[PDB]
Amino acid sequence: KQITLAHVIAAPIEAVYECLGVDHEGAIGVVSLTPNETAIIAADIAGAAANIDICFVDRFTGSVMFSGDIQSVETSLEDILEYFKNSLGFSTVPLTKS
Template sequence: MEKERIIQEFVPGKQVTLAHVIAHPGDELAKKIGVPGAEAIGIMTLTPGETSMIAGDLATKAANVNIGFLDRFTGALVIYGSVGAVEEALQHTVDGLCQRLNYSVCSITQS
């Protein structure tokens, strides 16, 4: 039996590739993400992956949000809190990474 080999590559550069707010997620989705009962969930993907630590720091200092998941290897960050707090935290984080650290950033989206 031949093993499948997967190679994961990262492009050089500093980017926020996703910044999304899920307002009022369904119970099943919130539970699957690992934040049951959350009023809103913020999702970010960042390159390089270590940026997730900086983003988590910026987000939690900007608004009353909690970290649901942070992975410094893949650059994933999940925050949760009230809709307004998650929106504020994501905006502050995207702005901070862009203005202070010269990251290329995407627009914040919402569903």
């Protein structure tokens, strides 16, 4: 049980927005974890902050992405890292910004 990425893109670009198909507004939170199925649980905690929009949940690769105000995304990532670490006994990586 590992979270290998819990990243936030503060200021994405047109090509990054167009790729995900979002409103060209806000940060993007990216998460990678193993086992791959737990992307469904991570997506749930990220989606609990109602202003966060789930971009895609891939249960095969273990990937989650979501958009919203920089602050909401950081809280969502922080919440995912905190729960998975303390409750689900995952070994989490530190949060990263670009």
